[PDB]
Paper text:
The heterotrimeric [[name]] hydrogenase, HydABC, from [name] is a soluble cytoplasmic enzyme involved in fermentation. It uses electrons from the one-electron carrier ferredoxin (E°′ ≈ −450 mV Schut and Adams, 2009), which is reduced during pyruvate metabolism, and the two-electron carrier NADH (E°′ ≈ −20 mV; Schut and Adams, 2009), produced during glucose metabolism, to reduce protons to hydrogen (E°′ ≈ −420 mV; Schut and Adams, 2009). The electron-bifurcating [[name]] hydrogenase from [name] (HydABC) requires both NADH and ferredoxin to reduce protons generating hydrogen. Electron bifurcation is a fundamental energy conservation mechanism in nature in which two electrons from an intermediate-potential electron donor are split so that one is sent along a high-potential pathway to a high-potential acceptor and the other is sent along a low-potential pathway to a low-potential acceptor.
To investigate the blurred regions, symmetry expansion followed by classification was explored to separate the different conformations into classes. Initial attempts to use D2 symmetry, to match the core, resulted in maps no better than before, however, using C2 symmetry revealed two classes with bridging density between the [name] lobes with local resolution similar to the lobes formed from [name] and [name]. This bridging density breaks the rotational symmetry between the protomers in the Hyd(ABC)2 unit, explaining why D2 symmetry expansion was ineffective. The two classes correspond to the bridge domain being formed between different [name] lobes: when rotated by 180°, the bridges are identical. Despite extensive attempts, we were unable to find a class with both bridges in the closed conformation. The observation that both bridges cannot close simultaneously suggests that these behave as reciprocating elements. In the bridge-containing structure, the two C-terminal [4Fe–4S] clusters (named B3 and B4) of [name] are close enough to exchange electrons with each other but are too far from the next nearest FeS clusters, such as cluster C1 (≈35 Å away) or cluster A5 (≈32 Å away). Furthermore, cluster A5 is completely isolated from exchanging electrons with all the nearest clusters being >30 Å away. Thus, unless the [name] and [name] bridge domains undergo substantial conformational changes, the FeS clusters A5, B3, and B4 cannot participate in electronic exchange with the rest of the enzyme. Fourier shell correlation (FSC) curves showing the resolution of (A, B) the ‘bridge closed’ maps, both reaching a resolution of 2.8 Å and (C), the ‘bridge open’ map, reaching a resolution of 2.7 Å (although note that the bridge is much less well resolved than the core in this particular map).
Author numbering:
A (entry chain c): 4 to 159
B (entry chain b): 1 to 58, 70 to 571
C (entry chain a): 1 to 642
D (entry chain A): 94 to 185
Write the structure that this text describes.
Amino acid sequence: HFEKVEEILKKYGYKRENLIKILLEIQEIYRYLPEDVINYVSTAMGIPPAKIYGVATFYAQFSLKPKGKYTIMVCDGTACHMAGSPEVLKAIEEETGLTPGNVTEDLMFSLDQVGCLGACALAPVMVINGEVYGNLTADKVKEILRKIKEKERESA
Amino acid sequence: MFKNAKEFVQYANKLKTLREKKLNGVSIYVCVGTGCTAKGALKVYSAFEEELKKRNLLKVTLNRTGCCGRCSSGPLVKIMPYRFFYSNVAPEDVPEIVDRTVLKGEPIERLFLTDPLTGEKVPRIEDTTLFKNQDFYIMEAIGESECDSIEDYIARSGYESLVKALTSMTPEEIIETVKASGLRGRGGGGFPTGLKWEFTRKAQGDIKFVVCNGDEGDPGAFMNRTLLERDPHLVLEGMIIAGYAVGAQKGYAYIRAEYPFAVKMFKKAIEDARKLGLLGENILGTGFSFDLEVKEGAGAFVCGEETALLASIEGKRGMPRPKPPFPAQSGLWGKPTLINNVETYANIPRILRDGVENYRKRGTENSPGTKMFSVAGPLKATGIIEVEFGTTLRDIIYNICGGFVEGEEFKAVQIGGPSGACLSEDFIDMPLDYDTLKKADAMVGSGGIVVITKKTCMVEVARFFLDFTKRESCGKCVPCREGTMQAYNILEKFTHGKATYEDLKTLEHLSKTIKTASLCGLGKTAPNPILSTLKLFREEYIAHIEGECPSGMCTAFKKY
Amino acid sequence: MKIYVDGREVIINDNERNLLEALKNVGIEIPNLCYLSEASIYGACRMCLVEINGQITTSCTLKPYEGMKVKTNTPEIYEMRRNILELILATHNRDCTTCDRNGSCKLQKYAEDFGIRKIRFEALKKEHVRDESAPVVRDTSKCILCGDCVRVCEEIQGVGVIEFAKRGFESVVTTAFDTPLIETECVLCGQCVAYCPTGALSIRNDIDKLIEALESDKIVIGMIAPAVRAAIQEEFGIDEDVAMAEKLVSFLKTIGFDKVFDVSFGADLVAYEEAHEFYERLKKGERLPQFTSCCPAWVKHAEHTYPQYLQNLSSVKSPQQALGTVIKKIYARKLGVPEEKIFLVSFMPCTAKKFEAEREEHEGIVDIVLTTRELAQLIKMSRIDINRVEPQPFDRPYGVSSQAGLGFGKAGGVFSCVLSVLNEEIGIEKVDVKSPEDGIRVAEVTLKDGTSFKGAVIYGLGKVKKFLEERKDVEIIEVMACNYGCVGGGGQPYPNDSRIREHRAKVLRDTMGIKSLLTPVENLFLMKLYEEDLKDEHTRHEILHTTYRPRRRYPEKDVEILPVPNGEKRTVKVCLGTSCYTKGSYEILKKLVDYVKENDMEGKIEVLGTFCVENCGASPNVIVDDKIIGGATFEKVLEELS
Amino acid sequence: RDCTTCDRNGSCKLQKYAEDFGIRKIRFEALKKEHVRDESAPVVRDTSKCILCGDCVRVCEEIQGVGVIEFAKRGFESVVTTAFDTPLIETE
Ligand SMILES: Cc1cc2nc3c(=O)[nH]c(=O)nc-3n(C[C@H](O)[C@H](O)[C@H](O)COP(=O)(O)O)c2cc1C
Ligand code: SF4
Ligand code: SF4
Ligand code: SF4
Ligand code: SF4
Ligand code: SF4
Ligand code: SF4
Ligand code: FES
Ligand code: FES
Ligand code: FES
Ligand code: FES
Ligand SMILES: [Zn+2]
């Protein structure tokens, strides 16, 4: 019994030309692309599920696993890479035990390496839920990760 | 302004009067372009709002402006009546700015722009040495233009070129003037746009399409998004003029969903143009119909290819196909499609407003116009700059960007991302052109620039670019799909200090195969970094085969 | 047109699409790995490089022009072609001994010809998929990503269950979410296998079961499909041969088969039963139009796609199942041997018959189904010249069949058999046959009394959708999932293109022509079967009739965090949607995970993640034992867990 | 079982029988053998493809009269090799 998905499909008129936009909306709502959701979308649009799967796994914005509570985005652009982004990625791995494209056991953290964020003056750059932290290093990345970990752990 | 053009003329004149009124008064512009927001520009805007509201002295006005070319100089704020440019404006000193400057007007020395070359602070950005060393032809009204305002764009003489084209000129003359101006495709190829417009117009078909490629074509460049966030209506007007010239009734703008501000700005510009009648079923009552839509890019570097872009727009996987039949004949849904870069469309209205001789006054005989770049890497001043098509790399690196940060030295420069070239100091004194350096194994590219310093291992640079290309390959043809990963494996072996001369020979011979046999441009230029570094930095590869790494960053052997 | 190939005058053709095809028409071959089947396209292999005006380019995308100088062989082109082939072979699962394309693989032949004796590149690892849950077996480690199967499934079969996924080095042809092919909407027609140029797509081989059965003490009974005899001769590279079935009988009896029957007898029986059923439907004008149920691929397709037409499907089971049920339930009693003692072997040209034999409604009737290729393998193992085998007739009482029964092997066979049965029962004044499209034929039939109907024959799945959407003036519709009927089945010898299928149809027609009795009633054995065993309607219904059920995916596929493979548990699901994420849900999930980390030593509690449960606006939701809570939190889920 | 990079590919009796017998899987686990690969001489040795038919030994001894290759070890470790696994280029 899907309602929001039906609203999106009706808004875009069950047209394949708008499949990517529909999938972006569905991800924004569900935070990822569940198999059931796009199975329903395929049934409604008369498009085989394999087609939607091929489209979804081709573009980066689409994720097949739930996004982490604190989604981490580490720029891998040229400037950020020569500025020390691999060190940032290694620090993130050693701290949270994950590599880009993965999520933690409790969905607390997720990681994805992206292109230039338009802030090369702050290379290397990391983004967490829209909060950008520039001029990063291994020590700074580890320190901020611990701080956010404690902050979330508090709950209260 | 919805029936005749004289109403639009009167509307523009009164909007100009209103803009002059507001400009003469005290107004605040905070650069909300990408990079400045990363530094806290939006929080600065919030601080300005709250401080100016509690004091309740609004006849002040607060406005959002686009990139001003000094992204690295903190969030940017300037006041109009006294054109004082403020840099590194934190949300904590906003009340100080309001009290000292907005109310009284005393210059604030502590919050001005330093001069990287002369080591001094100048109150006005227009008086800065970097500003004078540049050539602003596309970017205009730096720091004093409202990105989200069709009213402001009209008040700055905007949309006049489209009206001139519609009421006065006929598509043939428009295409003729575009051809005469010599404008070349800013997307990187450099193909003459006028010839492309001829190809699209001559195509046999009643329905045609105009497609704008918003992609940067580089994972280290932010020119197109910055231009979109600066003056979206400029690109909008260029696209409308192109659709009129090639006789199209529908246009698509392809902006990445990863860029929320660019998408929002272009959507708002489109809605404003439609509301004001610039877009709709009857533009200015001349029998010409045209509408524009923004299509979200879900993220795929291969979508910069024309065929892949067309497949992506239509809702399929961005898979390129053998170019003939060309998109100029059969593009979107088999119909003729004009595909150009954002900067090309931005240039179009500028050429139309000016002449052909006036346009050619800037640049070279074969490359007229200007090019907007995005310089990065360790430099005193980094951000978006515009230069004439005759400038050298030294001018940009030192005189415009201020040079390198203390304790750093020049090694090499990347000019077009992975598809670009790696240039050493032997090409620094070579004027930029689509022809002068297209033969010395170099290319201007989409407009991205990244400087490489002595502490950078170039084998690692090649490895990084090949890793990117291996990730971005669509996987259709054997050469790119397989060879990119194999070459990345070889380069990784080189980085891990376990390579050999056999690996070097294999890489050199596989690069030729990838370059020649690949289907589309992604795989064709995939081995460009390898070829560039081996032609310019062979001794570093040899040292790596010996476990030396003169640069010494890539941690594979140390403290033994 | 005149062109210069390697410096010699060559005349290609007047109008041509590309240089490669023009030269191939001339007789000049350029190595390539694109033209691999009838569903092939050009541009992916990149191996057809030629040199023209200095620059190298692919000849498949090069439009020829008058007097063009083209060099098809230069040291640079040799280097590039060998590099491309080595790239393909580096990541290819090079185990040809156990491959189904061994000896008929273009990649293998090129590796031989190109003298590739060692891999200069690294055999990098991929996230390969190995699906063996269906008679169609997927092994993506042998896939060359030609895409022929995708085009076959989408454009030719109209199902589209397999597609390209991911990109770059990780590009893979697979089902959605790597779902097992048995669990998807795949109809198992086997056409993708028929067109696959590598071992990536293959048929499940069940020769071991047959051999262990023959070695046992059970009575093995074989029954051969009509279209198996029309194509088996290709595997041995010999010419067409009528009487193929009888020398097959001789060979099967030699290798230990106690009885061998003809599935054409089952086809005659099915045609008789379906003709009577269709006549009843006509006289009542109900449950029309009627669909033939002889093609299991079409039956499964209808169950997946046309749940409203399941009542229109013929109740009669397919010839394989009908004859097998007759054997197991009547012949066993006549022989005084328990049904467990009989081992039934079916030789079919179809992969969907393997699925049909394993259906719940057909459980235990057909023990194993072997395709034409597996039968050819059986013959080749013995190394006896089948051409020299003296034929002997099928075994009684299910050995003879009418020409109409043997016509089942190609499209339009069952419709013609039904027409013959009706004509014999009640004459047919005339039949007018039209051909709206290539694979669609419509017949207008007038009976002697005066009542008339319309019947359509559709071969090739995917043409059914348009016909059903636009044509509503028929009473009976024959649907065959494969082009040309069963002569082009999934299990037929490779290659399996249209020319060989037409030749197979011609061979089957020639075999039909030499049959004396023309209609099922003339089959004395069938009438004896009706008079002695199927005399009453109750036994006939339980023997020859089956029921069909709708198919719908049942995907739960909830996010797994701390799953428990089995055993009674609590299966707590935490919603991970945006609205629920907006306040708490993720914190609640973390707290519950840490709770089961400190408590819950055993698998009593199963912590799951789930997507939006359509209960937004009612605070974060936490599903417990498939129950809605609303306003959930750690304590509110602990209390319920108590 | 790597026929793509084998010199008998297309003219191997074992390959043809594997094709004909319908051997699409092996329930017998692939045991590990101390295989010998040699590349020192124009004549290349690879005992992992050897079926221990003994034809090469007879050819070398009876026909050519050199007898530099012979059966060594026994049982599962049976191998046709040179004395002390010496590289061919260093033997007679
Ligand atoms: C991998 C790849 C990425 C590309 N990215 C861009 C891009 O981001 N922007 C652009 O204008 N052209 C890009 N191009 C080039 C266009 O696909 C193509 O040249 C198009 O015709 C641009 O038209 P223009 O020359 O008028 O700008 C790319 C090409 C390739 C092969
Ligand atoms: S070169 Fe790369 S991106 Fe281009 S078609 Fe081939 S595989 Fe795709
Ligand atoms: S598809 Fe099979 S026969 Fe062909 S090369 Fe691969 S493993 Fe060998
Ligand atoms: S067997 Fe038929 S339906 Fe199934 S994947 Fe292959 S072509 Fe598609
Ligand atoms: S499975 Fe077979 S037909 Fe399909 S793409 Fe792979 S090799 Fe081609
Ligand atoms: S048409 Fe014949 S071979 Fe094809 S799926 Fe149907 S029964 Fe099987
Ligand atoms: S015993 Fe000798 S001839 Fe026989 S397979 Fe082994 S190496 Fe070859
Ligand atoms: S390269 Fe990372 S923000 Fe520009
Ligand atoms: S984004 Fe503000 S100066 Fe560039
Ligand atoms: S035949 Fe394959 S790319 Fe030309
Ligand atoms: S987001 Fe949880 S019920 Fe919808
Ligand atoms: Zn190094």
